[PDB]
Amino acid sequence: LDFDILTNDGTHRNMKLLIDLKNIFSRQLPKMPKEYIVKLVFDRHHESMVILKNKQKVIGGICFRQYKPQRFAEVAFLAVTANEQVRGYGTRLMNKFKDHMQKQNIEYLLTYADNFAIGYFKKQGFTKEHRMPQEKWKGYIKDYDGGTLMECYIHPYVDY
């Protein structure tokens, strides 16, 4: 099991793993428009950490967008393929991601919870109540009335 940041570098290998991840996102988020998932995943501002099984089988991942100078990032999509769930991968992935964001000097993670995912994000330390003022992410992260915006603080010296 490897947790690697997947770069869209135009290579057959990488773009294959990104499509694989996009397809997992699509299946785990049936209501999310597939063309929209493709748009964000291959976007110049988005990055993806994938759960690589046996060096070539992606079984899950997180697609995120860093707002570097602002020190916060948005988790656009997160999922683990159905036949690999309840095996501890979801938590390990978020932990590896938090460790990466910590090293990236990102102090806050924001995400609009899938509602079927709220329990997961609550479990990963995210909260419905914000510590970061809306004014802070206003103009960077979209403000939707629907969906639950949940936040998670990344402490500078907590071991993830």
3-state SS string over the chain? CEEEEECCCCCHHHHHHHHHHHHHHHHHCCCCCHHHHHHHHCCCCEEEEEEEECCCEEEEEEEEEEEHHHCEEEEEEEEECHHHCCCCHHHHHHHHHHHHHHHCCCCEEEEEECCCCHHHHHHCCCECCCCCCHHHHCCCCCCCCCCEEEEEECCCCCCC
Q: Which CATH number is 52's domain given?
A: 3.40.630.30
Look-up of token digits 């090293």? 103
Q: In which domain, by residue range, is 5 found?
A: 1-160
Domains of the chain: total: 1
Which of these is catalytic: 35, 47, 74, 107? 74
Catalytic, 74? Answer yes
Q: What is the experimental resolution, given in Å to one decimal place?
A: 1.7
Residue with tokens 């294959």: 16
Q: d(Cα 17, Cα 52) in Å, to the nearest integer?
A: 9
Asked if residue 80 belongs to a known ligand binding site, the reply is: yes
